[PDB]
Amino acid sequence: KMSPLPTVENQFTPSTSWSTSVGDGIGEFYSNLHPAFADGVVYAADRKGTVKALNADDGKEVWSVNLAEKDTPALLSGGVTVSGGHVYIGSEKAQLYALNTSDGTVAWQTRVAGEALSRPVVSDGMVLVHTSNGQLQALNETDGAVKWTVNLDMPALSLRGESAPATAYGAAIVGGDNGRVSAVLMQQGQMIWQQRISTRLNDVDTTPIIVNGVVYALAYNGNLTALDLRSGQIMWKRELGSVNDFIVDGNRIYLVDQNDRLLALTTDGGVTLWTQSDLLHRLLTAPVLYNGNLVVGDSEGYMHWVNPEDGHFVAQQKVDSSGFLTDPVVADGRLLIQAKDGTLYAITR
């Protein structure tokens, strides 16, 4: 019971610069596994354990490794995250891998507390993982040693959604599955503040987003909340039907709700600017802001290009029959997106 393709007059025709296979992708499994970009290179993976580095200009292979064969599928899940010469990927077997950007060799591999379903987050010489047993762990970037472990939320009853940390000025901010946002010091994991923002096939990204000393966070009840970074004080709350995913760019918020409605809000009190409801139940990706357009993929393999000022469609294109699920990312002036069968596209216009 999904909405038919809208009738769109395309203002331009998006162009594929390049596309490359990456094993067998995620198939029919839910995943948060998405591509990454750093210093002229794209990094991408599949669930079974293929990991590749590609030249961002032409898609040509720099290196390829198979983590299934390091000795059975690796079940790569959280990431990909790139920082400081390392490629970080979490797995459903509770492994965190750190690969060298130079050649794909394993610098280190750590058995973390639980399934690593959410992207690793790198700050202040440490890599943070929020694991599905409800713990937050900080590991040294140099050897993957566990520096500290903090108890945050409940061991998960859903395999859908994402809950990564967000870092600012020596603090990690974390949401999760129990309607709380927590702030902890990166040094030793000391609790700074904790705030209640709320009193399964749950598909909510509870990852906080920090912009200009404000924390923006989604909860299970369909609420979007703004908190003061230093204190955790609630600045405002917005009662939407039920939100799934969002981004913040300057003083604008772009969200997708559980029914695949697209909304734009102000950061000044969470007031709605516009709504676009013609993609209802088409199962959208998270939105990305790319060269003045808001872009989403859908389960049928289409990409939809939206004017961020008014929510009007500017382009619609069929790209991959296997469909889209995981986050699109901006890479070297191109839009990167990975299909469910693993195929990676680099698109302009």
Q: Mapped to the 3 state alphabet, what secondary structure does the chain carry?
A: CCCCCCCCCCCCCCEEEEEECCCCCCCCCCCCCCCEEECCEEEEECCCCEEEEEECCCCCEEEEEEHHHCCCCCCECCCCEEECCEEEEEECCCEEEEEECCCCCEEEEEECCCCCCCCCEEECCEEEEECCCCEEEEEECCCCCEEEEEECCCCCCCCCCECCCEEECCEEEECCCCCEEEEEECCCCCEEEEEECCCCCCCCECCCEEECCEEEEECCCCEEEEEECCCCCEEEEEECCCEEEEEEECCEEEEEECCCCEEEEECCCCCEEEEECCCCCCCECCCEEECCEEEEEECCCEEEEECCCCCCEEEEEECCCCCECCCCEEECCEEEEEECCCCEEEEEC
Question: Is 184 part of any domain?
Answer: yes
Question: Is 138 part of any domain?
Answer: yes
Q: Which domain holds residue 181?
A: 126-239
Contacts of residue 334, defined as CB under 8 A and 6 or more positions apart, other chains included, come to 17, 56, 346, 347, 348
Contacts of residue 247, defined as CB under 8 A and 6 or more positions apart, other chains included, come to 209, 253, 254, 286, 287, 288, 289
* Cβ-based burial of 291 (10 A; exposed 0-12, middle 13-18, buried ≥19): exposed
Report the alpha-carbon distance of residue 46 to residue 24 in Å, rounded. Answer: 6
Report the alpha-carbon distance of residue 7 to residue 312 in Å, rounded. Answer: 12
Question: Is 115 part of any domain?
Answer: no
Question: Is 20 part of any domain?
Answer: no
Scan for tokens 């405002």, then name that residue.
236
The pair of structure tokens assigned to 172 is 């990690």
Name the resolution in angstroms.
Answer: 1.7
Backbone angles phi, psi at 246, to 5 degrees: -160, 165
The pair of structure tokens assigned to 202 is 């749950």
Question: Is 215 part of any domain?
Answer: yes
**Number of domain units in the chain:** 1
- Amino acid found at 117: L
Report the alpha-carbon distance of residue 35 to residue 45 in Å, rounded. Answer: 7
Q: ∠ CA(253), CA(37), CA(226), 5° rounding?
A: 20
Task: Identify whether the C-beta of residue 32 lies closer than 8 Å to the C-beta of residue 326.
Answer: yes
Cis before 295? omega within 30: no
Experimental method: X-ray
Question: Is 176 part of any domain?
Answer: yes
Question: Is 32 part of any domain?
Answer: no
Contacts of residue 183, defined as CB under 8 A and 6 or more positions apart, other chains included, come to 171, 172, 173, 191, 192, 193, 194, 229, 232
Using alpha carbons, select from 41, 99, 43 the residue that is nearest to residue 70.
99
Neighbours of 189 (CB within 10 A): 16
Question: Is 174 part of any domain?
Answer: yes
Task: Identify whether the C-beta of residue 305 lies closer than 8 Å to the C-beta of residue 313.
Answer: yes
- What is the gyration radius of the CA atoms in the chain, in angstroms? 19
CATH classification of the domain holding 235: 2.40.128.630
Report the alpha-carbon distance of residue 335 to residue 349 in Å, rounded. Answer: 9
